[PDB]
Design a protein around this ligand. Structure first.
Ligand SMILES: [Mg+2]
Length: 115
């Protein structure tokens, strides 16, 4: 019946998480960093997610970029996903745009999220 969950999306904020969750049509673990995250916790997270298909979806702003920088150093296995700079933040991006970003990265998305 059910297949194992192997995809993980990492986001910065709780609202980002709720929004990403709303668009998905398959089970995905969504990890929220709640702003900044320590190197230790990140190494620990990277270790735990060994063998998972991991993605980082951050805002188009300095704080989002700081997170990306940390991940490129501490967690190079994580694949970076981007929203259009015209929307700036994941929170401000329309649901359909989020859905397309995820769809392009081979996530199952709800058809309803495109309308
Ligand atoms: Mg931001």
């Amino acid at each position: 019946a059910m297949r194992r969950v192997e995809k993980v999306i990492i986001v910065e904020g709780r609202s980002d998480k709720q929004k990403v969750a709303a668009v998905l049509n398959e089970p995905v673990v969504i990890v929220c960093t709640n702003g900044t995250i320590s190197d230790a916790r990140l190494e620990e997270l990277a270790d735990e997610l060994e063998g998972y298909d991991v993605y980082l979806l951050a805002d188009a702003d300095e704080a989002g970029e700081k997170l990306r920088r940390q991940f490129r150093r501490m967690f190079p296995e994580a694949e970076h996903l981007y929203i259009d700079r015209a929307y700036r933040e994941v929170a401000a991006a329309p649901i359909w745009h989020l859905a397309q970003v995820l769809l392009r990265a081979r996530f199952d998305v709800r058809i309803e999220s495109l309308m």
